[PDB]
Amino acid sequence: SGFRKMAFPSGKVEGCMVQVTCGTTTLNGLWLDDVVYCPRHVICTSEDMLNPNYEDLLIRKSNHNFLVQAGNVQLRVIGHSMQNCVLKLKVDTANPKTPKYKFVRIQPGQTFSVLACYNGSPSGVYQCAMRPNFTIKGSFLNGSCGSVGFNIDYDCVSFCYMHHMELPTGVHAGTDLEGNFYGPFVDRQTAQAAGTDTTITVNVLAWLYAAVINGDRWFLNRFTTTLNDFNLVAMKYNYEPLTQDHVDILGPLSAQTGIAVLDMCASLKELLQNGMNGRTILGSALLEDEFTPFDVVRQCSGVT
Amino acid sequence: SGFRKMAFPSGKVEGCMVQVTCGTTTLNGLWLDDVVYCPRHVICTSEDMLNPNYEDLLIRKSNHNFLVQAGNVQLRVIGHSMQNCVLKLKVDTANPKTPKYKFVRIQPGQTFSVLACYNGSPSGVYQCAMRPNFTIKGSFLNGSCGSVGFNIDYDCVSFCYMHHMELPTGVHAGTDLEGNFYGPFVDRQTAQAAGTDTTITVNVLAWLYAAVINGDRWFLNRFTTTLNDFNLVAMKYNYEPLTQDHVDILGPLSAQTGIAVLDMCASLKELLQNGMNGRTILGSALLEDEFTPFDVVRQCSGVT
Ligand SMILES: N#Cc1cccc(CC(=O)Nc2cccnc2)c1
């Protein structure tokens, strides 16, 4: 019973967080095996951020200029290299707490947990989604750069995000663990605007399935629709187009509840056109889109 | 930038989760030092739950009847005792991962993180609040009993909740770590109804302060009110009465934003009377009450 915005347990990632300092800049790093990953903007002064030439800035740095601290003990840096927008600092000690891991680049609409850190110390964990405009709506202050996003499949941590920047609108941008930004963003103190933050339709449908499984059924109607008809309404409401791939992914939820995917689409269409009328679904007054179909199945079945 | 429903990092609590089996019932336990704490209803069959006499049921149990497994290794039970609604199983090995800890009994309106577990294995972490009717709105399936609620102050874990039951309405009830239920609930398969789930006013005000700090200011109005006037409106909307103690606790947020507490109360009064008009605050279409004033300060300052 009940449906919560749930994050993965963070212990496996807590054992990987370190503090990286270069000059007067301190941010977080991720220590896996004998490598520490961190945003390359750790080498910048606030002045350098206006128009940085990272290759040029890096020439003035040596291994001893990168201070890596894991708990209250210093790690020895024996190598450093830049890969896209991340720095990889080779240390002489493999992290004894390195979990089984993979680096994955997620698609928009995919969710992940974030372990927000400051000075290499974890402060909190929350669940979020890669928005269709390639931003994330996180909770990050100065010093949170290098905090990471991840998913866990039993004992393997798939790292998908590393925090780099806050846009002038207060939304966040970052990279995968290969240092490639999600979206068109760059690590520069220049005004960068985000595109339309559309709603992740397949996630809203997954969450409507979660509501039916948990007893919230008031919104279920006597109508059905087609993919083309639904998508005309979705376009009008800045919802992402629903494809047959999305319908396929919702199959197990449709099977569990006995509600055909297109019937749930018709319920969603009426919610868009009529509003909630002061009612709530799963304690929310708006349609939630940061639960994927896989998250709904996992939470409703108790996958550990 | 940004404000998220954030849980404490769960690693310290993950290292304490064990599986406790008695006969055909399996639930979670919390292993601290050489004691494993778990709901006493682990000794019951589904038939015993209709009208259990726990003292009588316990006479038929011996130390060897309680199977405690930590990872893939079995712990030896050398003693067992019942304290209110929890069983304390003394084991021959102190948990090597025992963090610094305290057992606290929280007040309604207080928030905590929950590490939801199945078979002694963590599946997720979420943030919740002890409701004014002493229920929690969690996300728990069968097998989640023994999952715990906690707060962390730097390196000390204060355990405040242990999950025991799901009421017929799908809301949850549990105990503190001394085994005393929050509210009037009992560990019996009998219909128990919850009282009015009123809104935690001081938490809503804290969250309105968080919205102003993060740029959402549309709801700020040109009015002020008094505690007595505000409380007449709060009673009408099933909001908890606001006291001078609550105003005192909101002082640092009032100081940071320059918005007097009673002025924020007047904004809240207008939100209650006029509704949101299809607008959102911090991405929500309803007033959020599961952030305490301390949580807002912690998240907005980056306490690790
Ligand atoms: N890449 C990059 C980058 C470019 C310019 C400036 C900065 C600094 C920055 O955005 N910090 C920050 C504050 C608050 C939240 N999250 C992050 C980072």
Ligand SMILES: N#Cc1cccc(CC(=O)Nc2cccnc2)c1
């Ligand atoms: N004390 C107690 C108690 C009494 C009767 C029955 C039960 C079983 C029960 O409520 N499980 C459960 C399911 C789903 C979520 N959380 C928990 C527990």
